[PDB]
Curated annotation (Swiss-Prot):
Transfers electrons from cytochrome c551 to cytochrome oxidase. Coiled coil: none annotated. This is Azurin. It is found in: Periplasm. Residues 1-128 form the Plastocyanin-like domain. The keyword Thylakoid does not apply. Cu cation binds at H46, D112, H117, L121. Its main location: periplasm.
Length: 128
């Protein structure tokens, strides 16, 4: 079945999807992130970070304290299942992860850890 998704986050604080479904016959799953807009990474950086729904708050809280030079993730954060780089306008990055990290029945969120962004640049991810 399809095992990749293209995602944009723009300068208007939107990802172009808020809901990803990962087909359970996929062995790996790829997210391709790009960033329409004009603003640089240090003011309008976005990443795509996956964790369980329950872990999202703590990843976001620790990430935002970690600084730009950490790409806004706490180093060795074991809650992070997969993520792209933090990217600014005009840049792109992909991540491919093993679908065996995901479990059916569990709720996942993807989100941006750039400070303050996750209230807007987030959505759900389901293994179906
Ligand atoms: Cu397939
Ligand atoms: Cu952002």
């Amino acid at each position: 079945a399809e095992c990749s998704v293209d995602i944009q986050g723009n300068d208007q604080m939107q990802f172009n999807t808020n809901a990803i479904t990962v087909d359970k016959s996929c062995k790996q799953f790829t997210v391709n992130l790009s960033h329409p807009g004009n603003l640089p990474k240090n003011v309008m950086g976005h990443n795509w970070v996956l964790s369980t729904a329950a872990d999202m708050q703590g990843v976001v809280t620790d990430g935002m304290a970690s600084g730009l030079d950490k790409d806004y993730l706490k180093p060795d954060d074991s809650r992070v299942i997969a993520h792209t780089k933090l990217i600014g306008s005009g840049e792109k990055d992909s991540v491919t992860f093993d679908v065996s990290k995901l479990k059916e029945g569990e709720q996942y969120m993807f989100f941006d850890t750039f400070p303050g962004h996750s209230a807007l640049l987030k959505g759900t991810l389901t293994l179906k």
